[PDB]
Symmetry: C3
Subunit: 30 residues, 3 copies
């Protein structure tokens, strides 16, 4: 259960970093 | 503590999937 | 490993709440 949590958290961090970049582009009009 | 982590990770995955859909709509102009 | 997971999940929750606010502003044209 801890290894499952670790993989899903790593996948969320990647997905969150992707969202942050996309939203910054939207906010800044890049 | 592991069960708390599991519930919060499941809630983050739902919230992240909601954000992904909303951002795709914004990016694609849907 | 559980404490590392806890800190990273807390950081994701903050980052996700920031994204939610920013996306709501984008969607509502605030």
């Amino acid at each position: 259960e801890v290894e499952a949590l670790e993989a899903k958290v790593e996948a969320l961090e990647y997905k969150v970093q992707k969202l942050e970049k996309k939203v910054e582009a939207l906010e800044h009009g890049w």
